[PDB]
Amino acid sequence: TQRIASHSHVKGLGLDESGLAKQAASGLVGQENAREACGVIVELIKSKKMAGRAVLLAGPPGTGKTALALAIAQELGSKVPFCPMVGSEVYSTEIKKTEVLMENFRRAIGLRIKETKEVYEGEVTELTPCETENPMGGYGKTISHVIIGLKTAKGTKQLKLDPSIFESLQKERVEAGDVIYIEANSGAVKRQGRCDTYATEFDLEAEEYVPLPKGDVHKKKEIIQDVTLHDLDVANARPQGGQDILSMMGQLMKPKKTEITDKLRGEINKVVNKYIDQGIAELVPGVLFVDEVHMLDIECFTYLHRALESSIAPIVIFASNRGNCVIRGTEDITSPHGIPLDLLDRVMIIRTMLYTPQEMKQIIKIRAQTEGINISEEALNHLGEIGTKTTLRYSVQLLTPANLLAKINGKDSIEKEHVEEISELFYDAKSSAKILADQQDKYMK
Amino acid sequence: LLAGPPGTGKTALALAIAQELGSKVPFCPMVGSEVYSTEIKKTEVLMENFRRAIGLRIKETKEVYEGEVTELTPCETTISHVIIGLKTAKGTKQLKLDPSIFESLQKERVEAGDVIYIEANSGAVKRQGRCDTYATEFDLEAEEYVPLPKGDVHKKKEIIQDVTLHDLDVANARPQGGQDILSMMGQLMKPKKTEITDKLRGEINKVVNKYIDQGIAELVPGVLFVDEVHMLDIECFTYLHRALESSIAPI
Amino acid sequence: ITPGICFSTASLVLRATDVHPLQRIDMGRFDLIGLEGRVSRYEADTFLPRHRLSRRVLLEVATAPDPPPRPKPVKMSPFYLDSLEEKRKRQRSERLERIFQLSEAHGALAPVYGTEVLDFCTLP
Amino acid sequence: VTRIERIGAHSHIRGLGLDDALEPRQASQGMVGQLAARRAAGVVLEMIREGKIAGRAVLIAGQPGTGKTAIAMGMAQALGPDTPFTAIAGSEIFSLEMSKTEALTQAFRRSIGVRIKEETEIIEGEVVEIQIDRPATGTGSKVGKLTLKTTEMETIYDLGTKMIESLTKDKVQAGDVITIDKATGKISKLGRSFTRARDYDAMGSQTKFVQCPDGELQKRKEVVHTVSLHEIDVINSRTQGFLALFSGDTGEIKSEVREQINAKVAEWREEGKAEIIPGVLFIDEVHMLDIESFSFLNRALESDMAPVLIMATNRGITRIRGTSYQSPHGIPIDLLDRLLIVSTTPYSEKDTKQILRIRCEEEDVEMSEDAYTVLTRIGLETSLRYAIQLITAASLVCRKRKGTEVQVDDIKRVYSLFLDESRSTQYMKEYQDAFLFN
Amino acid sequence: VTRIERIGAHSHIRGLGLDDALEPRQASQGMVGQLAARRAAGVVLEMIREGKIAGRAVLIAGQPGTGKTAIAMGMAQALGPDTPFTAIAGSEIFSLEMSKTEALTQAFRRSIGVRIKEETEIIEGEVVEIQIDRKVGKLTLKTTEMETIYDLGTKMIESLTKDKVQAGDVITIDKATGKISKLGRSFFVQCPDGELQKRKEVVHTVSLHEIDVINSRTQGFLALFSGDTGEIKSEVREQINAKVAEWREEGKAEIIPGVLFIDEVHMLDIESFSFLNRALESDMAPVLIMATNRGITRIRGTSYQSPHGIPIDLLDRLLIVSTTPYSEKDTKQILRIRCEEEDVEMSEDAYTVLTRIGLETSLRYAIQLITAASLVCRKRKGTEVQVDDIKRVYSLFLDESRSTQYMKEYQDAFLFNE
Amino acid sequence: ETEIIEGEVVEIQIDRSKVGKLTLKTTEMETIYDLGTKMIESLTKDKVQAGDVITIDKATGKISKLGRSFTRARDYDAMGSQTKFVQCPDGELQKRKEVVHTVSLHEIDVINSRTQGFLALFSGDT
Amino acid sequence: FVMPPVEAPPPSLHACHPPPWLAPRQAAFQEQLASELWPRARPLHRIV
Amino acid sequence: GPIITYHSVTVPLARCSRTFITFSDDATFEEWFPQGRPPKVPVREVCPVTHRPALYRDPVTDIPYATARAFKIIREAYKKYITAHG
Ligand SMILES: Nc1ncnc2c1ncn2[C@@H]1O[C@H](COP(=O)(O)OP(=O)(O)O)[C@@H](O)[C@H]1O
């Protein structure tokens, strides 16, 4: 978090309340049409009423596609799930590509569960049965309640409980002076150790003595837990915590992703629907971002057709900087973005354009501000001129070496000489390619 | 590289080099097509052979107490120690054993009249049968009767054994023994070669350097001979570029 | 239900890998993976460098008489042989030297990770 | 609140929309047009419902966007949950855990259901009083008595030791409406007829009550157990198969196990124990199968346990994967002889407009007639799916400007913001050097 | 009764049919003709039995259906069961369990055997009385010549309790191990005659691969039956080779070099051939015999053409035995031998017609037609195969040539013609 | 940073596996401790006896054995592979242990991947 | 309901004069593993 | 025999569920409900030598202490007591 990454300046989409894109806001410069389309897509995500919709960010490299996707993620917030993914990740040695894609799809669909957990804490001060003056059956003594006195830091309360709790109390070996907690939703007593006021400095127990609970005896709170469908699927496919031989085998064996069946996924969907109907949980459909979609092969694209046609799928964002390239896994089949035309028919294409020199200068200034670097106007103009040739990434990547060189030279700002020296020290892609071409005989292969 | 037409003696020259070096220098012969394993990556095979070629010579004196057991009495304070009586052709010796050895003696089912040996440095106990003087105690027992040991009860031998870095790597790749349930279930697992981490390699190098400084170890760099090297692919050659530049690699 | 397969082999085959202890070195001096979960960074770094035994201390303790009995809690030479004794004291010296060498050998190695590091890094 | 299932591509299709004579209506149950293809789908659906002929294969072939998957989803929705419908993609059979033939076999056998119908004795009533007497110390025989009540009965039951243990585990109290199966002794709580005593603390908020059951106490109810052939194979393959039912990881099931299961199911069917419910396997984009998978399909359709197989492909004369042979639809002619082909014709203007109207009704979007005309023109020019996407895009744009009806301006705005394949390809040609490869 | 070993393709081959001077006979031990190939095979057999030269490799090359596998089977038959003869196909070395080099290394080590002799005491008799009391016990055993009472130890008492032994059972006990195997009950197997306790000399021939697998891990012998060997470490193999050398030096064991036969070796790829090139140079390498019918053919895994599909570097280490096509007389003699093997009686005209058919098309086609003609003759209640039956089975069953002609007639009806 | 108790075991008395007392000593100190059920179970599981030099973590109660003290009666002829003789600790019985180590993120991932994931830090079968 | 057509115990390794420590070690390993794991396998009893 | 009776009844408030537990003999009732009195807080012992709160307890002298110097002083005092009283 403290370290500055390449998209550390993107705090969202700089959109007006009417959806129009401001020239420079929220860390984004230019790309007004793409930003407006991404805002429409953000509204679509927030509407939560569409499934399997796909958006493709298409444009030359270094044109803000990943920045736009991260701006979408920032606009949605941490509540909305956002599962980034590169196309190379589908090639796994454990599960098939379709399984990886399905798992990421289920990772993007989130579920938020709201529940109230009511507990009674305290140190047991009193344990007195409530006998009845008329014993049932004539002989012996009958009891109708068990009075438990619970003491905390700022109070003491008595709880008239069901007589059946006597067995749980004996099983937990609860005696006077012990700290216990009783859960309302289950009616069970759990002994979380003994109070520390009865412990001496000469005792050696570690987890036996516990501090007296603070606060009130009756504690209730609302617990909000955010989970994804993939979390439930994996937790049910390879369960952890059992005491049977299968759980022991799972612990022993090397963990391995498995092909989760449609039966388990249907059961999870049914449980989630039941929870939603009960009012416990609220569905939070998020976004799956698949960067470098062109690295997927023809099998992945074909599966993606069925994946997107599903009614449970999230909203998928693709990104490709390829032209009329050959689809991987096929022999001499060319498609406009490296994506077969069948999948391109299922997506909405957002075009990202190249940046004018003014926009490049603005982006350089913003990146310098984010990295804590003061740059002079002449140095900024020289770096923008360097960015007119070469690329924008080269210019934003010369900022920190130049700052280091200035600091070594003893200056708090980047001057033009520092940028010139850095340009002399480091070559760009075009200059290196020219050097290689001029000496193609001396290099290898 | 030995380059020449077929039948010109490249393998013969390598074997002549091996003969000139002697059996004390590790000569590891491999064929280029042996890197295509189905358990580990090709670079792992190459690095395993590299560590195989490097040899380490360790000089150590081992002590073993061997003989027929004439008495086995644990001494209670728990058990402070175990007094054992071992008999050989050259006499009898009474030994006091660390109480941890009592568990090993009980596991091996050692009773009076059994012929055992105990390793002094490790406390390992092996019950190598019953003494043949007791072969007539029953007319039909399913026992293996072994002669009484000939030498002294206490046997000392100073030995020099050569090991390779790969031996230490595979000795530290998986745990041995262990009475836990996971360890026992791991003993049933099929033994598979694994891509040993570079952290483990560096730690083993540190251990080897420590023992060399102590003066109990000597390094024999050795030679790894790769025949039919043209069977290696481009990835193997690229990895060889880095591996040969290491300061730890063999010839 | 079928009877099992009785596979008979030479008794010499089952002893092919077996090596006599006098013919093999102790590989426990290179056992790094066995130390995990048993030896801590404290033992290797702070305790053992400070409280390692010395030959002088070992000899002094061995030669000194038995310690006096612990106090109870209060609520408040005709048959003498010189050669036999020389052999016995040589054996005692050898035993003490072996004890020292084994104690040094069994605590020479430091764990790669240690119990503290593993416990700190192990989430619930 | 939004359920886990939301508005998808085929969310408006509730069935094929046919009449009794399998004559397709122009617009019913979401389906529009494709009259001949829908009639063929209805005939195939009747064949599936009859469930008498095993291993029939149908190929839905047509241009992209002609409603092949729409027709398949309509067939699936018209079948109903009683009949199995396994829908997979062609790419899904390529697995690192099992062979292609094993994956195809599992896909087939997930589409056949085995149903076992048996009658059991069931006790359902309101607990009036339950008493359990147990020894104070040491192992002993617990003695108990339970009282159950309906609207017309009340009986006092003497309880055995195992029923006592079951009741103790279930924590059955007075007022709990419980179900008891006499054979297995299983007890299932289904509610409380009234609240517990108020004087007790730490009890929580009482939920709603359940009315006491009527009729006799010990009734006779029909219990139906339904599993697929794949589930039987998985749970019989190995001890851990029941966990493999959820984790996958079945490996390759032995052919001996499958032969035993086929024989046993045939014996059960002869002995009236179980009924076979053959279903459908839908392989979308069957052109991704290789020559080996097609060859396996050739002989796997010849079994009497095979379901009806429905394939969809939009390929012309194309090279078969794994070979260098050009074949229609990417399928070998030997398999093409074993299947009937259903062609889908392209949609006209009125069919496109009706599809757009149904989609807008499904998405709760109100659109003007001029906007419908413009959107239909766009769909004819670009594609149907592009127009469907622009539907929602224009709905969102209209909602942004605090409107109520989607106008032509919103459609033009979303046409400007989002591009089709043609305009994207044109703009990429304009900047060909900027894009990376070719 | 029908046993597992029925009549196969080489069931009639019982040897090489050579005399003491390695001069082949015209017809002997199921072998007809090919004098040069049989003489070379006899020389290779003498080399194998001598056991002095290690890693010698021989290739049997010739046209299809020229007795290459027949020569190999005769070589295998001339050697006894004592000498290992591992026969695999080239396809078998391609495995998902281990590498190709590992497969060839295990193929090599399966061909070298270690012969170990040891003495054991074996007690075989009929149980008379077994007594166990709370441990002590007595056991009384009898033969047809003597009777004895044994005082039992604890371990033997446990062994006799584990394997239910009652009076009247005839059992054998291995004294050192307690291995009790019940071989029947007598009042069904006759009671043993001679001494009750016999000292026997048991000889085991254990291959190097078997030693490696047994010593690879605990309960590792199971891998000899269920695969699951993985890739055995080279350290274990070197240790086993060293220990076997120690045994040979100390006289505890004898090495029995054997033969590894790889039929259709052209299925091997360049990697396997390169591995074999150096695997043959070890002193523990067996004799390798290979057969292939390929002419100048692409080597698998490469684009190079080689005379046998084998790279020339390996071919420089091979001795090549060439098989020549058979004449009319040799073909007729082979047909007679196969008829005698299958218990089929033919007329001389039937033999002539079948010889002409075999010469015109193939020897294997005629050998196959023999059984079909016998069945056709048995269908019409005949006893001897006539020319009519041979013509009937010729018409019923096609050969490759006529099948190809008929396919070319209707080439459009078939699938994927090129 | 962890508080520990470090000393040589003098006496272990267990009354009847219910309650007991443990006596620990240094070269300058000696004290007796009251044990609970779990402490007694941990002491019996590790087979802690007299003369052993042990450290006890106050927070978790885990006991690791450093060595044992050497006495005239412990002159063993053979020693086990893990036993080693160490001097009785000096100073105070209660001590603070500070451990500083450098690990990588991948190592923590491997540690928390499975139950005994630290073994994969050696084998590499991650 | 599926039963294997054949059922056999695992193959046994026999030698005339085996190392007298192998069998007790294997027996102890099997006994400990059974004593530790059989209680955990009781739920699968009906399946078995 | 000696039994514990668990009883659940339906009683009018219109109806509510109540549970009762009946013990056949008073010995079982006392065993399950000992009615133990609240425990007593131990006295925070203090080192007689340094007056700091006690952290240790010398087994020989049973005198709590909180310093090594305090331990040495206590052992010296015990030795003097042994010498005097004998
Ligand atoms: N319009 C923009 N406004 C602000 N920053 C941008 C803009 N476009 C790109 N960047 C930044 O410049 C860098 C270029 O990367 P990017 O354009 O995201 O690559 P790609 O084009 O492959 O998505 C990124 O770190 C991004 O944060």
Ligand SMILES: Nc1ncnc2c1ncn2[C@@H]1O[C@H](COP(=O)(O)OP(=O)(O)O)[C@@H](O)[C@H]1O
């Ligand atoms: N200079 C030499 N002197 C003696 N023998 C040789 C010589 N060169 C080769 N040979 C023999 O010729 C055979 C083939 O040589 P080889 O080592 O295979 O050459 P290469 O390894 O280059 O193929 C070997 O058995 C070797 O013993």
Ligand SMILES: Nc1ncnc2c1ncn2[C@@H]1O[C@H](COP(=O)(O)OP(=O)(O)O)[C@@H](O)[C@H]1O
């Ligand atoms: N005849 C039709 N009636 C109703 N909706 C249709 C029809 N044809 C296509 N659609 C809808 O158009 C969208 C794309 O059609 P689709 O069936 O995916 O084409 P394909 O046949 O190429 O799969 C789907 O959401 C589908 O619901």
Ligand SMILES: Nc1ncnc2c1ncn2[C@@H]1O[C@H](COP(=O)(O)OP(=O)(O)O)[C@@H](O)[C@H]1O
């Ligand atoms: N010389 C021969 N003597 C006896 N039988 C032969 C002879 N040659 C071939 N056969 C038999 O005829 C058949 C031809 O097979 P074979 O010639 O071994 O094929 P390949 O050419 O692949 O080795 C075999 O069944 C073999 O038994």
Ligand SMILES: [Mg+2]
């Ligand atoms: Mg489709």
Ligand SMILES: [Mg+2]
């Ligand atoms: Mg052949």
